Amino acid sequence: PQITLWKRPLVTIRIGGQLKEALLDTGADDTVIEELNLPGKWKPKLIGGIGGFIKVRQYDQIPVEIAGHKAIGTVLVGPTPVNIIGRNLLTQIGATLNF
Amino acid sequence: PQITLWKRPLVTIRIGGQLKEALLDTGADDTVIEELNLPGKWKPKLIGGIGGFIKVRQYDQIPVEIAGHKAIGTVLVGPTPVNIIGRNLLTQIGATLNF
Numbered sequence A, B: 001p002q003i004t005l006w007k008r009p010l011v012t013i014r015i016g017g018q019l020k021e022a023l024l025d026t027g028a029d030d031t032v033i034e035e036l037n038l039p040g041k042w043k044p045k046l047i048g049g050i051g052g053f054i055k056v057r058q059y060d061q062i063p064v065e066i067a068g069h070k071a072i073g074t075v076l077v078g079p080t081p082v083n084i085i086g087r088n089l090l091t092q093i094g095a096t097l098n099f
């Protein structure tokens, strides 16, 4: 689809069998989801944002369906204020910015 | 123009007549620049994201040219590792997400 930016670009995703809402974030390297369980193993990681750094769980090779488009890649889980889909998955679904 | 997301979407902007590199961030409501010597009246604000909040200075009606496309609006100034172009200005240059 084509998404304008007057509102936050929030979409529904499928992850782990569950539906969630997430923000399409071109300013994020990685995909960061609110605290939850995901199948499989993980390892601790730290990531940073506007306010500093947080601890997350790094899960690899997780399938995520993003507005109907499939991706399989790293998902970080931790105390983010909002679920964000970052460039590691945006690239998989063919997303570009256009102006 | 079309910008892919293989790398961070860093582009040249002009603010205060000078050129800087900034990240096009669809996950940002607002525009955050690290330019603490702007002239002009400002007011204190707090903005947040991953890691919490920081203090910024809010400047209004500041011209910002992005990749040769003129915009004018609110700019927040504060300590950030990367200059961020948010939706307040992305909308003014006609930017969309496409997949």
Ligand SMILES: CCCC[C@@H](CN[C@@H](CCCC)C(=O)N[C@@H](CCC(N)=O)C(=O)N[C@@H](CCCNC(N)=[NH2+])C(N)=O)NC(=O)[C@@H](NC(=O)[C@@H](NC(C)=O)[C@@H](C)O)[C@@H](C)CC
Binding pocket: A023, A025, A027, A028, A029, A030, A031, A032, A046, A047, A048, A049, A050, A080, A081, A082, A084, A086, B025, B027, B028, B029, B030, B031, B032, B047, B048, B049, B050, B080, B081, B082, B084, B086
């Ligand atoms: C989670 C909140 C929404 C998404 C987030 C994305 N912003 C980018 C900006 C870039 C860095 C300052 C971000 O955090 N990116 C992270 C996401 C985490 C991730 N791992 O992908 C990033 O790429 N982090 C890199 C580091 C980038 C820093 N740059 C650098 N070292 N050169 C990383 N690998 O850890 N938006 C925001 O942080 C913005 N917040 C908002 O837009 C709203 N605030 C809230 C709480 O939602 C609004 C109500 O203020 C800020 C900028 C104020 C307008």
